Amino acid sequence: XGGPKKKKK
Amino acid sequence: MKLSDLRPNPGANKRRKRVGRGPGSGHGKTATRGHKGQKSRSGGLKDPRRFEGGRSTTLMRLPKRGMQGQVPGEIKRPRYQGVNLKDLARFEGEVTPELLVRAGLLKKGYRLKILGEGEAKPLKVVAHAFSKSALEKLKAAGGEPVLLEA
Amino acid sequence: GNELVRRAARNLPWVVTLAPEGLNVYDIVRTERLVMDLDAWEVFQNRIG
Amino acid sequence: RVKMHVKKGDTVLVASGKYKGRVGKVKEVLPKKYAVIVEGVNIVKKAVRVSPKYPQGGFIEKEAPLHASKVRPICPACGKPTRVRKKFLENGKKIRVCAKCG
Amino acid sequence: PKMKTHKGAKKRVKITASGKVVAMKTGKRHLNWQKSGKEIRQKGRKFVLAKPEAERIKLLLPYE
RNA sequence: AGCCGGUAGCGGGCGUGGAUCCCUGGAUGUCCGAAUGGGGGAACCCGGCCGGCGGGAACGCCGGUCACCGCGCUGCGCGGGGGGAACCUGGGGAACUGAAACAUCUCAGUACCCAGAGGAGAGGAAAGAGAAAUCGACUCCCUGAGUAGCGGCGAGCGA
RNA sequence: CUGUUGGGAAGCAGCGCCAGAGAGGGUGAAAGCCCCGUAGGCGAAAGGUGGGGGGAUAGGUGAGGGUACCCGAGUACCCCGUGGUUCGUGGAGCCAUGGGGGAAUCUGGGCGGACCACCGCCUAAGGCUAAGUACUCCGGGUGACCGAUAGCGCACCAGUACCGUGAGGGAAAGGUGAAAAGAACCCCGGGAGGGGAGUGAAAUAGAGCCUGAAACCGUGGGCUUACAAGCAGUCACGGCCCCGCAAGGGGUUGUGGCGUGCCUAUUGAAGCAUGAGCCGGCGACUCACGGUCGUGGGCGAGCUUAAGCCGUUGAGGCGGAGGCGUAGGGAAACCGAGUCCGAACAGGGCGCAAGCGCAAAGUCCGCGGCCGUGGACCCGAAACCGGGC
RNA sequence: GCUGGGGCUAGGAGUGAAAAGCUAACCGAGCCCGGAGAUAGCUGGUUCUCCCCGAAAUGACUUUAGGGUCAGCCUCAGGCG
RNA sequence: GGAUGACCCCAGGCGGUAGGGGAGCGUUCCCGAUGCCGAUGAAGGCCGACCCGCGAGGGCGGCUGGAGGUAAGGGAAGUGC
RNA sequence: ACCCGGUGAAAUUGAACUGGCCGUGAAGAUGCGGCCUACCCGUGGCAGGACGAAAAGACCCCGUGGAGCUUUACUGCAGCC
Ligand SMILES: [Mg+2]
Ligand SMILES: [Mg+2]
Ligand SMILES: [Mg+2]
Ligand SMILES: [Mg+2]
Ligand SMILES: [Mg+2]
Ligand SMILES: [Mg+2]
Ligand SMILES: [Mg+2]
Ligand SMILES: [Mg+2]
Ligand SMILES: [Mg+2]
Ligand SMILES: [Mg+2]
Ligand SMILES: [Mg+2]
Ligand SMILES: [Mg+2]
Ligand SMILES: [Mg+2]
Ligand SMILES: [Mg+2]
Ligand SMILES: [Mg+2]
Ligand SMILES: [Mg+2]
Ligand SMILES: [Mg+2]
Ligand SMILES: [Mg+2]
Ligand SMILES: [Mg+2]
Ligand SMILES: [Mg+2]
Ligand SMILES: [Mg+2]
Ligand SMILES: [Mg+2]
Ligand SMILES: [Mg+2]
Ligand SMILES: [Mg+2]
Ligand SMILES: [Mg+2]
Ligand SMILES: [Mg+2]
Ligand SMILES: [Mg+2]
Ligand SMILES: [Mg+2]
Ligand SMILES: [Mg+2]
Ligand SMILES: [Mg+2]
Ligand SMILES: [Mg+2]
Numbered sequence A: 001x002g003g004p005k006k007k008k009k
Numbered sequence B: 001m002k003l004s005d006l007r008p009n010p011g012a013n014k015r016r017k018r019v020g021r022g023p024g025s026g027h028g029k030t031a032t033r034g035h036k037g038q039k040s041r042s043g044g045l046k047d048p049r050r051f052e053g054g055r056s057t058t059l060m061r062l063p064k065r066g067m068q069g070q071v072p073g074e075i076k077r078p079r080y081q082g083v084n085l086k087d088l089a090r091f092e093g094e095v096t097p098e099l100l101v102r103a104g105l106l107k108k109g110y111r112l113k114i115l116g117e118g119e120a121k122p123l124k125v126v127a128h129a130f131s132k133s134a135l136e137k138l139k140a141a142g143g144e145p146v147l148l149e150a
Numbered sequence C: 001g002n003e004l005v006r007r008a009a010r011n012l013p014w015v016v017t018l019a020p021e022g023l024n025v026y027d028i029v030r031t032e033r034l035v036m037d038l039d040a041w042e043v044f045q046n047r048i049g
Numbered sequence D: 001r002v003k004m005h006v007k008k009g010d011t012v013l014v015a016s017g018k019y020k021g022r023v024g025k026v027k028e029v030l031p032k033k034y035a036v037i038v039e040g041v042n043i044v045k046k047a048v049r050v051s052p053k054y055p056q057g058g059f060i061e062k063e064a065p066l067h068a069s070k071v072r073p074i075c076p077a078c079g080k081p082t083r084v085r086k087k088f089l090e091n092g093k094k095i096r097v098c099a100k101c102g
Numbered sequence E: 001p002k003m004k005t006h007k008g009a010k011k012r013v014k015i016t017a018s019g020k021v022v023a024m025k026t027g028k029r030h031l032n033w034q035k036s037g038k039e040i041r042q043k044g045r046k047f048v049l050a051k052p053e054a055e056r057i058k059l060l061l062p063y064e
Numbered sequence F: 001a002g003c004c005g006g007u008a009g010c011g012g013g014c015g016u017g018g019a020u021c022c023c024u025g026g027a028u029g030u031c032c033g034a035a036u037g038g039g040g041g042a043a044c045c046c047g048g049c050c051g052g053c054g055g056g057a058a059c060g061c062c063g064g065u066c067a068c069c070g071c072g073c074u075g076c077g078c079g080g081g082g083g084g085a086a087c088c089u090g091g092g093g094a095a096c097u098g099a100a101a102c103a104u105c106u107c108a109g110u111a112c113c114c115a116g117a118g119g120a121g122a123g124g125a126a127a128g129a130g131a132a133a134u135c136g137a138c139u140c141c142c143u144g145a146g147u148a149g150c151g152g153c154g155a156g157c158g159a
Numbered sequence G: 001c002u003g004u005u006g007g008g009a010a011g012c013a014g015c016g017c018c019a020g021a022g023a024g025g026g027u028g029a030a031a032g033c034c035c036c037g038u039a040g041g042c043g044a045a046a047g048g049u050g051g052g053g054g055g056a057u058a059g060g061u062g063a064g065g066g067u068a069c070c071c072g073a074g075u076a077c078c079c080c081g082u083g084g085u086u087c088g089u090g091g092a093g094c095c096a097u098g099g100g101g102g103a104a105u106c107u108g109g110g111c112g113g114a115c116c117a118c119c120g121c122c123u124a125a126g127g128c129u130a131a132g133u134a135c136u137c138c139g140g141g142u143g144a145c146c147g148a149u150a151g152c153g154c155a156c157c158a159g160u161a162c163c164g165u166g167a168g169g170g171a172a173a174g175g176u177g178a179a180a181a182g183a184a185c186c187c188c189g190g191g192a193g194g195g196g197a198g199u200g201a202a203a204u205a206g207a208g209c210c211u212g213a214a215a216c217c218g219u220g221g222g223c224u225u226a227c228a229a230g231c232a233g234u235c236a237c238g239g240c241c242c243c244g245c246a247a248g249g250g251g252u253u254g255u256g257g258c259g260u261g262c263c264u265a266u267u268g269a270a271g272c273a274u275g276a277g278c279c280g281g282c283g284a285c286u287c288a289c290g291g292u293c294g295u296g297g298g299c300g301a302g303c304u305u306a307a308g309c310c311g312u313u314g315a316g317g318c319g320g321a322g323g324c325g326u327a328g329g330g331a332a333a334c335c336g337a338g339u340c341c342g343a344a345c346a347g348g349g350c351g352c353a354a355g356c357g358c359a360a361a362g363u364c365c366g367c368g369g370c371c372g373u374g375g376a377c378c379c380g381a382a383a384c385c386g387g388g389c
Numbered sequence H: 001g002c003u004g005g006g007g008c009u010a011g012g013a014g015u016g017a018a019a020a021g022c023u024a025a026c027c028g029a030g031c032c033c034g035g036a037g038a039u040a041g042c043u044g045g046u047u048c049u050c051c052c053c054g055a056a057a058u059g060a061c062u063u064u065a066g067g068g069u070c071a072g073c074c075u076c077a078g079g080c081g
Numbered sequence I: 001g002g003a004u005g006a007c008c009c010c011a012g013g014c015g016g017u018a019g020g021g022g023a024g025c026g027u028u029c030c031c032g033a034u035g036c037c038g039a040u041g042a043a044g045g046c047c048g049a050c051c052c053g054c055g056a057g058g059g060c061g062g063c064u065g066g067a068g069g070u071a072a073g074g075g076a077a078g079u080g081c
Numbered sequence J: 001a002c003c004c005g006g007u008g009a010a011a012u013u014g015a016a017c018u019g020g021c022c023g024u025g026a027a028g029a030u031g032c033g034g035c036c037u038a039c040c041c042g043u044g045g046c047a048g049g050a051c052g053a054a055a056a057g058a059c060c061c062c063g064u065g066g067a068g069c070u071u072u073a074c075u076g077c078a079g080c081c
């Protein structure tokens, strides 16, 4: 996983 | 007596220390630290004999006791220790320094000044210095040479 | 302090042996009977003083 | 290097165990396991080996090892401890009464 | 290891025979332009109260 | 007096003309590795010179020898490379942190890098201490002493 | 040694015996005398060590007078820039040094904290030097050290398996029995695995083996339940089942009454705030040195030792350098039962003023509370820096 | 233009037809080890039993405001009573 | 009441968080042990409607287990989830 | 998808014997009060609810927390003069 996605929705 | 006979009398078996163990020992959970914050945390508080919370401490008083010395430091001067006639009213020999300290009244590196209150035993009292008042008191019974030798 | 003697009571379970300069309260209490020669009693007496 | 007080040639008393009192010649010494076989302990070793050499054969006898501290050497009397007496050459072992073995 | 004497305290305070703490008075420094003579003369030594117990704790070893 | 390691088995041997096993010394010791004939992606590849081996010139194998630096002799001899758990000396040398912020300060000549020495290293025969007509190389322990002092005279550092 | 109970004796019992040896370990269980040992003693041809003893060699040791030859050079010294020392530019010395200038050979030179004088201590610019000290890869001894989630990461073929390009990260996993005596053979089954037989004292000691805890999953029995409302319990009666001559007691639950889980966090939680699937193990108020009170003692105008020294089947003594206390005031000089401020013999601030042989100021240990410095109650960052990959 | 093989440049540095993209599946400063048990005035947790007492959420100051120092309120010992 | 405690009276007090104080109970280990307990059964395990204790717990009994355990009195902690 | 034979997970989970309304309660109740309704147990489905799950809220504020960036913020250093 490690994210890395930014908090979008 | 035996070993199963020994033991310390009361107050010394106080060995019981404290705790952070169960409920109804007191001393449980919060471990007598209260719920709290800084003081309850691991490190504790700043030095509380000194720290006053951010306002200027009582380091607001001032140095008067001036001359704190300079880099080379303490000057080696002579220093005299007082004894009282009363204290040396013990023995009845010729009372000298070294002889005085070798008895528990002087400390090694101190020149002898007899002085003070007490009754003057009729005796010779070899001394480095005398008080105006003790010089007179004992001059009515005995001799009292002054020192200085190499 | 009698070496040959101290040598001969040693292995007995009921005997603990000791030179005079060893004298100590634990070993005193440990045992029921104290047995010391007319020496030792000397140096014991010199201790207390 | 593994001492032991009895030898292949010796005769021994079984001093303890379920063969106490038994006398026999020791036939085997295995110092590594610290053990002697005599004529003493022999057990129903179920020779499984049906098919191979020696067919059917439910079981086998054979004498099984004993802890060497349970045997004792003996000569013109009973078992006695070994004392070695040096000669002018080698040293014989001998009992606490005379001169065991030769 | 050994505790250390707070030098800031040793230089400006004193422990009396009884165990009081004595220091000077604040205010005689500095702005005397015209504080009254009463004011500037009024500055000799005083004794701090229960709170010099803290000082005394920082001069363990000085003693008396 | 048993033995052929852990390890029995198959299958074979040795030992009371003293074995196994233990200690000392000696022998052999492929190849890599400071690796050192030269290469190289360590344990592989290719050689020079001398002697030997096979019919042995072309081939291959065996034994010897051939790196570089420093010092001393006029090519020869002596030494050096690399490693080692910690400890040691020197050449370099932080920051978190402490200061309830932070820059002098602290952490701290600490961690760490590097070079070198060893069974220790360093230090060590006074251009020294010091106020005692005084001590007598150096090193280590205890005191002296949280003292003398140092310090945004702060936190603290510290003979 | 014998007998005795036991599968097994060493236990127990009966007479003995050793001991400079009754440390320990092993033997089917609990052994001074069965085994290995222990006390006390002996031993190397060879290699290593040799600081202990002896011997040899190198090497070195005298006085007076006269000469003024020599006595460590870009050095001393001075300045600028810095480091070291407790010394942070401070009145800043000394000791080192990068830069600039740049001597002298005893009537010469450095230092004693700027500087000068005086009085003294030393003799720089060359080098070597054991011992006492640090350390523990290695060998040995001991333990109010661990006992397989502990103790080193590893008691077991572990820096392995495995993870990662790499540096690097890094596990889990010990025990049948005294002895394999490890279960021939028959029977079901393809086997696996069972049932007999047999070994063994013990076979739920049978080898995915000592003891076999809990969660969890089964089978059997007792009670109970399909008009019933539930923090699950509790209190009453009641029926059924089982114990106990009896009285009584256990299990279960029909009906009635009552009833807002645990923890943390909070003004306030059943809370629709936090954490917890359940069980078992690991898991958090320490220790060292100082300090301040208290307390148990020892000695008391005294108390006490530190390093170290000697002696020790875990035996303790010596050692008084020193520390704390008997005097206090004052920045200090100094004075002193007082001193300081002050002209003051005004004043005031700090100070001094002995309990009736017992006891006590004070000290030295033991113990306890709390503080100080240390990772100082445990867990956890976002990050910073160093050297490597 | 795409692509194989052989090479070089890296942590305050590379490389970047520029997004702070990419630099071993997480880059507004890589990874590993070390300083290190960094610091955390913050959060969570802090285990056996019984007995007596039993608060505070105030004031003053604070780069202080969810933290602290002194006072207040609690407890214990000793003394006065 | 003088029994000098933990004996019989009489009188009162006893909700309780943070907390202060006082008593104890268990766990590991040392002295007590060259001792004592232990095969006619140690520690540990599984049951109890029994005894003692206010309680933490300590006893007794049976089954399991197969080789260790450790009094009174004290000492020391890696001491109770 | 569903039924049968075969193999067989997961996140989650205080415990559960887990109904509606009107109220009450830390202000949005299956669990408290009153009433109403409801025999015991599943399978296929729908998602209103369990303030459902998953990630110690990214927004916001706080901490004398941390970084990246900026400049005529401070103080330094490279570089240059
Ligand atoms: Mg409380
Ligand atoms: Mg609290
Ligand atoms: Mg809490
Ligand atoms: Mg803190
Ligand atoms: Mg204070
Ligand atoms: Mg302020
Ligand atoms: Mg103040
Ligand atoms: Mg004895
Ligand atoms: Mg002034
Ligand atoms: Mg004036
Ligand atoms: Mg002092
Ligand atoms: Mg090569
Ligand atoms: Mg910083
Ligand atoms: Mg800071
Ligand atoms: Mg040397
Ligand atoms: Mg420093
Ligand atoms: Mg011996
Ligand atoms: Mg010279
Ligand atoms: Mg400096
Ligand atoms: Mg000079
Ligand atoms: Mg000098
Ligand atoms: Mg001078
Ligand atoms: Mg000198
Ligand atoms: Mg243990
Ligand atoms: Mg276990
Ligand atoms: Mg382990
Ligand atoms: Mg491990
Ligand atoms: Mg079978
Ligand atoms: Mg069994
Ligand atoms: Mg067993
Ligand atoms: Mg089992």
Ligand SMILES: [Mg+2]
Residues within 6 Å of the ligand: none
């Ligand atoms: Mg019904």
Ligand SMILES: [Mg+2]
Residues within 6 Å of the ligand: none
């Ligand atoms: Mg009910």
Ligand SMILES: [Mg+2]
Residues within 6 Å of the ligand: none
């Ligand atoms: Mg809240």
Ligand SMILES: [Mg+2]
Residues within 6 Å of the ligand: none
């Ligand atoms: Mg709230």
Ligand SMILES: [Mg+2]
Residues within 6 Å of the ligand: none
């Ligand atoms: Mg909840």
Ligand SMILES: [Mg+2]
Residues within 6 Å of the ligand: none
């Ligand atoms: Mg709920």
Ligand SMILES: [Mg+2]
Residues within 6 Å of the ligand: G273
């Ligand atoms: Mg929530």
Ligand SMILES: [Mg+2]
Residues within 6 Å of the ligand: none
């Ligand atoms: Mg919250």
Ligand SMILES: [Mg+2]
Residues within 6 Å of the ligand: none
């Ligand atoms: Mg949850």
Ligand SMILES: [Mg+2]
Residues within 6 Å of the ligand: G285
């Ligand atoms: Mg504590």
Ligand SMILES: [Mg+2]
Residues within 6 Å of the ligand: none
């Ligand atoms: Mg204390």
Ligand SMILES: [Mg+2]
Residues within 6 Å of the ligand: none
């Ligand atoms: Mg005390």
Ligand SMILES: [Mg+2]
Residues within 6 Å of the ligand: none
């Ligand atoms: Mg006066």
Ligand SMILES: [Mg+2]
Residues within 6 Å of the ligand: G375
């Ligand atoms: Mg620290």
Ligand SMILES: [Mg+2]
Residues within 6 Å of the ligand: G376
């Ligand atoms: Mg602490």
Ligand SMILES: [Mg+2]
Residues within 6 Å of the ligand: none
């Ligand atoms: Mg860049």
